[PDB]
């Protein structure tokens, strides 16, 4: 951190800022946490510090730094110049191959989080709890990697131990599952948080698929529920739409003339069941995406 120069702020919010920095000439991503989001900084750090968390589709950790006297919190990761999937989707259309590469890579990263790996260099099961296109980064190889583990929760099957932590920050409201919005989520059940990830993943699938061209037709980039909720929607705005109206992102008619998008639409709906138990697992989504190729 003492040998890094901040060059440009690639992202800002009430959470903090992410900066492009140079570390010995190599570009790095620098997330500067507000003192209010100190819990998120530690959760991400301890996962990267202790857990064997390394995968092609998880944002690569480099270093974490903190000085409190007031308090500055730094998380330094690899820098992906193409930006978030959210940014990338506004600027490019896709074909079948690149669309599948994107969503299969996300599914591969989510499966690796959710799967408990026993052993020495193993890992507990991890649920993300804030999955969204802005938290997924596009690499130059055309694959994606998941970022921002600040809300993540861990589970070990052996001890049946669930580390959820107390974080004042809740997930992004636009992506909250119905059981979160109606507050019926089993808060001490690890399976509940995985199923929350699957819901958000279904929404990201919809965001990507709209940008896949079929028969000369493509939709514009839109966030989930763009047509029914305002920008920066409230908890109550989301709950009315998802739980009362029971709305879900609409499937454009042109998708049903393309076999890939028809299969993706089927996948989406199997992430969007009101019943969290009915939703597919991450590993099953990855296998289905693989068969689509
Ligand atoms: C440090 O930690 C994190 C780092 C990142 C992260 C990693 N590599 C690249 C970026 C990045 C994202 C977007 C853009 N764009 C520039 C151009 N565009 C404008 C012209 C409109 C849009 C924005 C550039 C770089 C980021 C943010 C992500 C994280 F989620 C974390 C986390 N929360 O841990």
Q: Yes or no: say if 271 and 199 are a contact pair by the CB < 8 Å rule.
A: yes
| Cβ atoms within 10 Å, residue 29 | 22
Catalytic, out of 37, 130, 148, 258: 130
Alpha carbon nearest to ligand 1 atom 2, residue:
31
Dihedral of CA atoms 279, 276, 178, 108 in degrees, nearest 10, equals -40
Q: Residue 155: CA atoms inside 13 Å, Cβ hemisphere, count?
A: 18
Return the residue whose CA atom lies nearest to atom 23 of ligand 1. Answer: 10
Q: Which CATH superfamily is domain 82-293 in?
A: Transferase(Phosphotransferase) domain 1 (1.10.510.10)
- Is the CB of residue 136 less than 8 Å from the CB of residue 208? no
Q: What's the CA gap between 223 and 238, in Å, rounded?
A: 13
67 C-beta neighbours (distance < 10 Å), count:
10
**How close is the Cα of 195 to the center of ligand 1, in Å?**
26
What is the end-to-end Cα distance of the chain in Å, rounded? 42
Q: Is 145 in the pocket of ligand 1 (CB under 6 A)?
A: no
Q: Which atom of ligand 1 is the closest one to the Cα of 77?
A: 1
Query: Residue 119: which of 158, 148, 81, 162 has the closest Cα?
Result: 158
> What is the CATH number that goes with domain 1-81?
3.30.200.20
Resolution of the model in angstroms: 2.1
- 84 within ligand 1 shell (Cβ under 6 A): yes
Q: Pull the structure tokens for residue 273.
A: 């069941």
Query: Is the C-beta atom of 29 inside 6 A of ligand 1?
Result: yes
Ligand 1 centre to CA of 92 (Å) is 17
Two tokens, residue 222:
């839109």
How was this structure obtained? X-ray
Cβ atoms of 177 and 185 closer than 8 Å: yes
Residues 174, 254: Cα–Cα separation, whole Å: 25
As annotated, the residues of the chain forming the CATH 1.10.510.10 domain(s) are 82-293
**How far is Cα 82 from Cα 217, in angstroms, rounded to an integer?**
24
Closest to 208 (Cα-Cα) out of 114, 127, 289, 115: 289
Question: What is the DSSP secondary-structure string of the chain?
Answer: -TTEEEEEEEEE-SSEEEEEEEETTEEEEEEEE-GGGHHHHHHHHHHHHHS----TTBPPEEEEEEEE--EEEEEEEE--TT-BHHHHHHH--B-HHHHHHHHHHHHHHHHHHHS-B-STT-B-EEE-S---GGGEEE-TTS-EEE---TT-EEEETTTTEEE----SPPPPGGG--HHHHTT-S-TT-HHHHHHHHHHHHHHHHHHHHTTB-BTTB-PPP--TTTTTS-SS--HHHHHIIIIIS---PPPPGGGGGSHHHHHHHHHHHTT--SSGGGSPPHHHHHHHHHHH-
Beta carbons within 8 Å of 143's beta carbon, 6+ residues apart: 56, 57, 101, 102, 105
Distance in angstroms (rounded) separating the CA atoms of residues 113 and 126: 5
Residue 202 Cα distances to 16, 66, 72, 267, angstroms: 27, 36, 36, 8
Residues of the chain with CATH 3.30.200.20: 1-81
Ligand 1 proximity of 79 Cβ (cutoff 6 Å): yes
- CA-based torsion, 245, 251, 256, 260: positive or negative: negative
Q: Which residues pair with 138 in a beta bridge?
A: 144
**Atom nearest to 29 CA in ligand 1:** 1
Q: What is the C-alpha separation between 143 and 283, in angstroms, rounded?
A: 18
Shortest-distance Cα residue to atom 9 of ligand 1: 80
The full length of the chain comes to 293
The first and second tokens of residue 151, run together, are 């809300």
Contact 274, 193 (CB under 8 A): no
Distance CA 65, CA 41 (A): 10
What are the tokens at 53? 């968390």
* Residue 293 falls in the annotated catalytic set: no
Give the whole-angstrom CA distance, residue 115 versus residue 112. Answer: 5
């Amino acid at each position: 951190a003492r040998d890094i120069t901040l060059l440009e702020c690639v992202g800002k919010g009430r959470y903090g800022e992410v900066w492009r920095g140079s570390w010995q000439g190599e570009n790095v991503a620098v997330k500067i946490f507000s003192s209010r989001d100190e819990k998120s900084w530690f959760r991400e750090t301890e996962l990267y510090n202790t857990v064997m968390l390394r995968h092609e589709n998880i944002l690569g950790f480099i270093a974490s730094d903190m000085t409190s006297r007031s308090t500055q919190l730094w998380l330094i990761t690899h820098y992906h110049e193409m930006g978030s999937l959210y940014d990338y989707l506004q600027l490019t259309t896709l074909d079948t191959v690149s669309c599948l590469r994107i969503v299969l890579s996300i599914a591969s990263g989510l499966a690796h989080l959710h799967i408990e790996i026993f052993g020495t260099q193993g890992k507990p099961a991890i649920a993300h709890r804030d999955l969204k296109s802005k938290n997924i980064l596009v690499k130059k190889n055309g694959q994606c990697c998941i970022a921002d583990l600040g809300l993540a929760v861990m589970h070990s099957q052996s001890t049946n131990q669930l580390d959820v932590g107390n974080n004042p920050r809740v997930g992004t409201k636009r992506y909250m599952a119905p059981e979160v919005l109606d507050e019926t989520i089993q808060v001490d059940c690890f399976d509940s948080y995985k199923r929350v990830d699957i819901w958000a993943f279904g929404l990201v699938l919809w965001e990507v698929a709209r940008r896949m061209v079929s028969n000369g037709i493509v939709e514009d980039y839109k966030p989930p529920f763009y047509d029914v909720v305002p920008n920066d929607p409230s908890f109550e705005d989301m709950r009315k739409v998802v739980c009362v109206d029971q709305q879900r992102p609409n499937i454009p008619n042109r998708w049903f003339s393309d076999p890939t998008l028809t299969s993706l639409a089927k996948l989406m709906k199997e992430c969007w069941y009101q019943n969290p138990s009915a939703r597919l697992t991450a590993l099953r989504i990855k296998k289905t995406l693989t068969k689509i190729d």
